[PDB]
């Protein structure tokens, strides 16, 4: 098997429903593992669901309080795409309360952070063997993407951060080849001010669209190759895509955060398309409910012509959403753009009267065809669930 190449994105004009796991509905009888921060990544044979498990089954007493982000009992797990994660189908990849995974064409790489907040380490797993590690250098929650990394010609690129969420953190990119760290770079801060939870894809180069958790309702981004960071900015679109954010239309800021509705943000994604941009976002401008994707004409560039040419509403605003991220699927000579949406149920969502916090997953892929319309929310009646 050859290493994955720097292919362009395939043509696309809309997104179509792919896999949906209905994990919460299916967990009513306590079979399903509690998770959050799911994502999808594919190898030569299959696409897979990944998520950070909580070391408990949904609805059991050990699931109470799983809103807590970091415990020693969290592992990155893998399970068949669109299935609910159960003890009979999951694989445990590594101990982790923050993770990223990607397939380089030959083998899987994983980046797994765990340990004390002030002294975490990232374990690099390659072909199932622990091959390298990163030591916390700022001693404040060493952490990574919570979605797939990207590999070009054998070199994998992954965003890694350490330092105070809310006090000037060090955002880095690491380059890793066959499980061995080659180099890192500190992300330039000339434009980007805050850069959490990058969602990345390949379109010749690696593009990452991330979360400014402090000052920007518009999303920061970077373009990277197998050698270096090439470009940075914020998405120009006057239609912002973080949560919270101002109502449409807002300000155009290509080089700085909007400086309004800046935090806390939510992990999200987008796809540059020529001078245009596709952006996922919650339907709500204030909370993690609903999900839509918009295409903004000339939204990647400084332009008077920003318009939402397409709006697909995929999860209604009467339903909970959560994180979202990009993944790619190799076509023949291009990469198809896809994404997942985390559908968070439980704490702290209003009226989800249970003690646990978990999610289900829904996914969509891009085609060069016109889409229809529908609604694919979590679908659980929370009143039916063990608390």
């Amino acid at each position: 098997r050859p290493f994955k190449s720097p292919l362009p994105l395939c043509p696309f004009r809309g997104f179509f429903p792919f896999h949906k796991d209905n994990a919460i509905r299916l967990g009513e009888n306590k079979d399903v593992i509690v998770t959050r921060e799911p994502y999808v990544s594919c190898d030569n044979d299959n696409c897979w669901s990944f998520a950070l498990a909580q070391g408990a089954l949904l609805g059991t007493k050990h699931s109470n309080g799983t809103i807590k982000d970091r415990t020693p009992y969290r592992s990155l797990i893998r399970f068949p795409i669109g299935t609910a994660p159960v003890l009979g189908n999951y694989k445990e990849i590594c101990i982790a309360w923050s993770s990223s995974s990607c397939f380089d064409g030959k083998e899987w790489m994983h980046v797994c952070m765990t340990g004390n907040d002030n002294d975490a380490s990232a374990q690099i797993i390659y072909g199932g063997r622990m091959t390298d590690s990163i030591k916390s250098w700022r001693k404040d929650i060493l952490r990574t993407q919570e979605s797939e990394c990207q590999c070009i010609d054998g070199t994998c690129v992954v965003a890694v951060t350490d330092g105070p969420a809310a006090n000037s953190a060090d955002y880095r990119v690491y380059w890793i080849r066959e499980g061995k760290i080659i180099k890192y770079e500190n992300v330039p801060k000339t434009k980007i001010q805050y850069l959490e939870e990058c969602s990345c894809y390949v379109d010749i180069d690696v593009y990452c669209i991330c979360r400014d958790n402090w000052k920007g309702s518009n999303r920061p981004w970077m373009r990277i190759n197998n050698e270096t960071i090439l470009e940075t900015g914020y998405v120009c679109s006057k239609f912002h895509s973080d949560t919270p954010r101002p109502a449409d239309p807002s300000t155009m800021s290509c080089d700085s955060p909007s400086n309004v509705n800046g935090g806390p943000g939510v992990k999200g994604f987008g796809f540059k398309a020529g001078d245009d941009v596709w952006l996922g976002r919650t339907v709500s401008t204030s909370g993690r409910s609903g999900f839509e994707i918009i295409k903004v004409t000339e939204g990647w560039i400084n332009s008077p012509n920003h318009v939402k040419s397409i709006t697909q509403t995929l999860v209604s605003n009467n339903d909970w959403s959560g994180y979202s991220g990009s993944f790619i699927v190799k076509a023949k000579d291009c990469f198809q753009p896809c994404f997942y949406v985390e559908l968070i149920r439980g704490r702290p969502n209003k009226n989800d009267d249970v003690s646990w916090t978990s999610n289900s997953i829904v996914t969509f892929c891009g085609l060069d065809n016109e889409p229809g319309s529908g609604n694919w929310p979590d679908g659980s009646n929370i009143g039916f669930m063990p608390k």
Copy 2:
């Protein structure tokens, strides 16, 4: 692996019991996924069960009301043939409330419809990647076979419908090659008036025997190759095979619906054999109970000589049945004809006093040997089941 070829059907003179999943009996302790619209399809290594799941486990609170046909929580799932579908053995193929699948000799293709009734889309999956789609053009429940499609020399043929169930719908056939739509045809309406839920097999050409849900107690059919629709009609047999239908013997109508007991019909199948025809049917002429298969001498043609030369009663009329469909299994130089029967339990069946609707499966294959006799119903005591 070569693409599957236009092989003839193998010789056969009776049908024999193959796999049975006993899924409802085995679901008494809430392990089994709620399904309906099952079917079977085989690749080079295995035959598989497929079905439209309901995103709930049988007997849980989320299973209440699963008589409802179309929700966002339905997915096409696959599980080992003759096993009950459980979280530990299933795979999720795609989001779908209507589906068809077929193996072309190299890879699996799936056709998956989901979304709003007035704007559904069909996703085409090939080798696990979403490769194409069909947009609803009549805006009224875009839908497909609920059994296996057929592929000849790399081109797969699948029946797709859009438009009012009960007001003149557009019935089409699509030709799809390596996941890419090549062309479609509108089914000629010179003979066929209504054409739902086609059950297809290969005997050199593709033959489909379908469901007229409005005017015909006799079944409509078409013959198709890798290029075009070759022939259409209704099954000539004066012994009708839809449900409801007149008592035997009825009218011979080769070119039009019987115009009696026309609706609602049920998905079913048959096999042309020379000038004869094998037809599956419920034992009841009014409801979905029992299952038998008959061979009608000269039943494919206009003839004074129609007689039921063979009647195999496979599920007694004291037991519930449901949909049935054909599948083929490659022999060496011919295809063996097989079929499945959906055994529906729960709503709306009289005295199935539970709130859910699901099914089990039983299957039979044709051999050129004389069969014995037996009875292979669902077998659940509904009074034992969680409601």
Copy 3:
């Protein structure tokens, strides 16, 4: 892969504990499928457990009354050797209330009987496809070995019976090659009078040691090759091995049933070793409790020198046993002799106060080393079990 050859048995002087599933103990929480008539058979990569499931989970309401031998809800299932059969690990091989399976070196063959007592049929499955069938010719419980068949140079040999248990049945051997029946023979009745449930192995030729269910406390046997039945008799050993049977020592009858304690018998096995014989048997001479294996000096022949040179007590007489059968495992240039013991719990066993009937499995293999001693019974406390 070449077809399996007519290899001799490897040298052996004792039997050693191999795999044990503890299926009843592990089924206390209703996870385990109800079974009986288990056996073991191996391919090039793995040994497997097989059994006739009852289409219900142990301890559920549908498990009540599973003492009943023949229902439409029984299937031959396969699961990893030494594991308990659960919905998450089993495969359904075919619908069956009597079965045999064997691997020919290239593919698995199965023989599966099901249907009405007076019109059953045997389906022959080869490489997963139904390839042939046998129609009941005596119309009285067409039935087979309940343990592995044997294949030599591509031709598989399997014992098949039809006709009154207790009124002169037709015992046959069938020869089947790549799933196609080649020929059958009626077993000669010059010596053998009753021949049920043969346990067979290969030692150059096929040897089968069976159950006379009417007149013989000594076991009937036959020797078969890829062409014909070569020899028949009853095991000469004055130490009998069916259940019930006379206390040791009893009569030597090489050519006829003992004519004492003849019925009902139990499926069992043995291994000829030169002029000696190894025989498995219950410890009790009256009921299905305990299990031991004995080696009888010159026990295969008419001789004044019969002595039990070895007695291994493997399941104590305070514990329930059941059926037992031989299987072989290819060494390099010989076959290793192994066997399984069915450990039946539930009805009708005295003080097993539950409504169901099921079993666990324990297995042993022969080595040319001296064995130790132990006890490997089912081990369930029946009072802990759901009834």
Copy 4:
């Protein structure tokens, strides 16, 4: 595939968290198999968890009393590394109440002891076939490592013991090639006095660090090749690593047990590194709580310079630990040193108010990087568990 070679250990300076199964937390709803004596061993494709199951699910009535070491209902089972062992994911390797496993580069070998205390036998399994056996020669609990054996150039080396725990036992090493016993040696007793439960790894030669259960708070060790035992001793380190043991610093004894706090000991491990040594140990000097690993400068040799240069506290002393053992993972031209820690919950641990005894697993691997810090205990709230 070539046989595994005598590679050196890779460079390492700290240990990093790898896989963690959280098996007790995940067993709250009675899905998980009761185990103890877990270990890890890897083949060319995967690392695996192994353990001695108890033939019962955790929290069921059959789990009551599983503190008992030896029953016929114990089997060596295998399950994916870092997953909880459940009926849907486990494989049963052999009947065993003591075991060792190792992969030789081509196939798995297992050593499985079972049977009566006074007449046990060890079954040798190779490529899934039982190929040889060892008969108890001292008639007193024939037993083995409870962690992975080691194979060099096709010859596997395994420590096997028979005779009174507390009255002069025979400690042996066996050499086994493709499942056939080649030879054994009696371990020299010139230095070693007691040698139980060896934890072994490869660093050119095989090194084993074991448990003196009678006289030594320091650990006995041996160095072995494919032919013979090369060297024996006790670990020189004045910082002892068995449990119980004296507080640091204690005595330096390279050639004899410390003769203080000698019993009962606990299975543990270490890694020689030049003249230095890494030693795992409980945090407590009296009981099985906590886990740390220390590196002792010149700790392998007689030296005035013993100092703990590194102490990693991996499980706090407020949490239960248990057995620990080494395993290796092939890098390219060296073996990476790794280890597991058994986290025992239930009887007889103070305040674990349940009737059963089981464990979870956590694992760590060595890298030539500086580690961070954390805590990875079992994590179950025992008050939440079925008793």
